[PDB]
Write a protein that binds this ligand. Structure first.
Ligand SMILES: *[C@@H]1O[C@H](CO)[C@@H](O)[C@H](O)[C@H]1NC(C)=O
Lengths: 49, 44
């Protein structure tokens, strides 16, 4: 296990980078995380769909 | 889905009718074939 010696006067491509990899999977459970459902206003006394 | 209905009504069981309403909705996925119960003992 060697170490990174990060100093501020380095060159881009030697400076530290924070990485976040995401991974989605749907095994067998018939509900879980999913994004937001948007809802608009609401009118009354009108034939509407 | 593991559903639970319940109701708490104040008063061998008596005789009457009372419909039970949904309590939870639990998207677990769990299989069940057996179960047990838990009781509060007397120690003091
Ligand atoms: C529950 O058990 C059955 C076999 O009795 C199996 O086929 C099924 O996949 C199991 N369900 C879950 C959610 O693991």
């Amino acid at each position: 296990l060697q170490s990174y010696g990060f100093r501020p006067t380095y060159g881009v491509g030697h400076q530290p980078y924070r990485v976040v990899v995401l991974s989605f999977e749907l095994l067998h459970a018939p509900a879980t995380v999913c994004g937001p459902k948007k809802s608009t206003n609401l009118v009354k006394n009108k034939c509407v769909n | 889905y593991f559903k639970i209905y319940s109701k708490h009504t104040p008063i061998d069981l008596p005789q009457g009718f009372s419909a039970l309403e949904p309590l939870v909705d639990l998207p677990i996925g769990i299989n069940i074939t057996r179960f047990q119960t838990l009781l509060a003992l007397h120690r003091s």
